[PDB]
Amino acid sequence: GSSGSSGDQKKFIDQVIEKIEDFLQSEEKRSLELDPCTGFQRKLIYQTLSWKYPKGIHVETLETDKKERHIVISKVDEEERSGPSSG
Structure with missing residues (x-):
């Protein structure tokens, strides 16, 4: 199908x-x-974010006590990043 859920997560993601x-x-x-x-x-x-923001930000999952496992983004740059690992 891919319509209900998709459109559902579309509003959420948005x-x-x-x-x-x-x-x-x-x-x-x-x-x-x-x-x-x-x-x-x-x-x-x-x-x-995989395609929405591949290079520019850094998504990480941090876990605390009350904050628990929560998604966290960071400021990234192109230059900084070396490039592809494989090479």
């Missing part, structure tokens, strides 16, 4: 994007913190 955009806009901002996904959604985020 909502996230906004957060990203804003975060990207801000200068001081160095790392953004997203909400802790349950599982599927989490994969979605990463999936989207």
Whole structure:
């Protein structure tokens, strides 16, 4: 099928994007913190950002006490990055 769920995660992901955009806009901002996904959604985020933002930001999953495992983004640069691992 791929329509209901897709369109469902589309609104969710989109909502996230906004957060990203804003975060990207801000200068001081160095790392953004997203909400802790349950599982599927989490994969979605990463999936989207996979193409939505392959090079430029760094997505990481940090886990705390109350914050628990939550998605976190960071400011990345092209230059900094060496390039492809394989080579």
